[PDB]
């Protein structure tokens, strides 16, 4: 397993700060409160308008091109179109595929957002709120929605796999963000109650998650189950007899913590840094389960300094970072295309190596990985 | 410089068959009745959703990437948003001249369309209809709009030129493609009268246009005169010494139009063609005046066979064009960017060709 990807970031699930459009005359900072900002059929129009833009075949050729052959789609909860005023992407998710197949490349579905949300970041679309866990109907729908995926997909040559949930939070992960505060809630009292989602109920989300999912894809197909930010937890977990062969842990590691950790702004450090902390440590579950970084990227302070320097850095520290997943089963870089404005906006300066086919363009990442 | 260059077609020039999701839950075929088609809140949702969508700052990048230095990009005549039901772009023009000086690229303004139409056509906004030349209050409007462009970016570092007006049609033309069958009116009292333009009346225009640009743009920007679908026409007109080292000609040549024309279908045909109703036709031109081909593609109904064949004459009718207009002052593919789906929409395949982005990743054009 050699699993060379990109997300579709921003696509089917929003994110505010990687494209201003479609925010433009609301005060929503996330997916849950931009229809509530908007016309029905406003929303409609610039919803329909964003899916059939930002992504379509010639995407899916720009990224075979570039050597990768896997994509880590997010798609939201309300994807069947089920749960107004969310306005349903299953023709999308279908198309995903067809493209897919075409280039051939392979999807991995991700499960990006569920009701009341899962760890109350913006990127869950409901921000500061963490309730799904705790509501047994919202878990059961997602239960539901992943055996319909599985049943809708389970035998195309286009799918990887199926990821049951993105990112839910753990208790540490929840204090030490301090989510409710970084992400602050519009209604106080949905907010009010909100938990972070223990190891012990995520294993049995995960039980369950299963029993969804292997039943109904084929057996060369794998479950993909996120570390729930605990990457050192899930050796007896993931080694059960049923899982053997079938299963990938994706882990989620961001560069930038390497400056809040000490690391010293050169290029020796921060590859000394993706060696230690990174490729070291991950390494060590790879030996009993198939590791994945599911989400990284080269965004770094020092870069935020001629041109050609941030050039030469960025560059490095992407062969780098690519070196240490060799040790792994792969990766999906976060994320393959934004619509950021750098030029005009020039807050977001050092913030547009989130695009990779623009850090490809720019030479900060290899013109090919394969 | 030698203009290497792609167009951006589609972007604030709609144009139907490149893109669909604009369209949707309308009848309408052109820019024109889009609007008439929508309520208005949708069609402003949509307009403005697909301009910030369909070109970025990403996509110079791109084309500078690519190796290209030059991008054409179509502007509507209601650019300054001065005619309703139409939306205003100055701001994206703006923007696009932000990113190709960062990037290093120059920009040819390209006037594509005017009230009533110069040509009928449906990428001129107004199918079967070709009136605004009779109009003179239109004819003035076109006018000032173009001097005001050339005062707004006429001093830019980013600015290769202005293109007073796109594809005016010549009576060749209109009757050799019966445009008015092929873009049929939709409102016949609208299109009664309508009729090609004049050599005689173009070059008026030209020169009211050139009056209007000339005095403010910088001596190392041109204007860019299209040839009106007469490519050995303008040696007399643009020799006069007032044009000397401020012109350049705007030829658009499709290899498709050797096949209306009789040409075999098969790569050796298609080179032949090439090199003889081409390069050595169009080399004549360039020996008296600048020439650009403003518009061509490798579009060809043989790719439309193994995809490793296909590949192979794509790449060589890239590669035969390049070399043809090499000897030219240069060139845009038409266009950067369409948003077609071959897969699944197999009316479109052979024609995605027409995407030059995608026609690098599939390997049919020089990386």
Not at 103 to 108: E, G, N, Q, S, T
Not at 330 to 347: E, H, I, R, S, V
Request: proline residues 4%.
């Amino acid at each position: 397993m050699k699993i060379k990807g990109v997300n579709l970031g921003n696509w089917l699930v929003l994110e505010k700060w990687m494209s201003s459009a479609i925010w433009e005359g609301t005060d929503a900072e996330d997916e849950y409160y931009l229809p509530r900002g908007l016309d029905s059929k406003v929303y409609e129009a610039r919803i329909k308008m964003h899916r059939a833009e930002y992504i379509s075949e010639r995407d899916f050729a720009r990224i075979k091109a570039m050597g990768f052959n896997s994509v880590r789609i997010p798609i939201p909860y309300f994807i069947y179109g089920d749960r107004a005023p969310f306005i349903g992407c299953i023709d999308e998710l279908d198309r995903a595929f067809s493209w897919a197949e075409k280039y051939d490349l392979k999807i991995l579905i991700d499960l990006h957002t569920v009701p009341m949300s899962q760890n109350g970041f913006d990127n869950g679309g409901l921000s500061g709120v963490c309730k799904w866990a705790q509501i047994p109907e919202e878990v059961d729908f997602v239960l539901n929605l992943l055996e319909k995926l599985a049943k809708r997909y389970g035998k195309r040559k286009g799918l990887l796999g199926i990821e049951p949930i993105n990112q839910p939070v753990s208790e540490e992960m929840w204090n030490d963000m301090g989510v409710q505060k970084r992400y602050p809630p519009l209604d106080k009292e949905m907010a009010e109650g909100s938990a972070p989602i223990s190891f012990e109920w995520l294993k049995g989300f995960y039980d369950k998650a299963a029993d969804r999912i292997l039943p109904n894809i084929d057996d060369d197909k794998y479950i993909v189950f996120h570390d729930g930010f605990r990457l050192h937890a899930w050796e007896e977990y993931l080694t059960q007899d049923r899982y053997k062969g079938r299963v990938i842990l994706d882990t989620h590691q961001y560069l930038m913590i390497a400056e809040m950790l000490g690391c010293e702004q050169t290029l020796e450090a921060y590859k000394t840094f993706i060696k230690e902390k990174f490729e070291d440590e991950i390494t060590k579950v790879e030996k009993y389960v198939p590791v994945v970084v599911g989400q990284w990227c080269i965004f770094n302070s020092y870069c935020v300094v001629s041109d050609e320097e941030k050039r030469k850095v960025y560059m490095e520290l992407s062969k780098a970072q690519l070196k240490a997943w060799d040790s792994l089963s792969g990766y999906f870089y976060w994320t393959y295309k934004m619509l950021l404005d750098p030029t005009n906006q020039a807050t977001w300066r050092g913030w547009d190596c989130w695009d990779l086919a623009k850090c490809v363009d720019e030479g900060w990442f290899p013109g090919r990985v394969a």
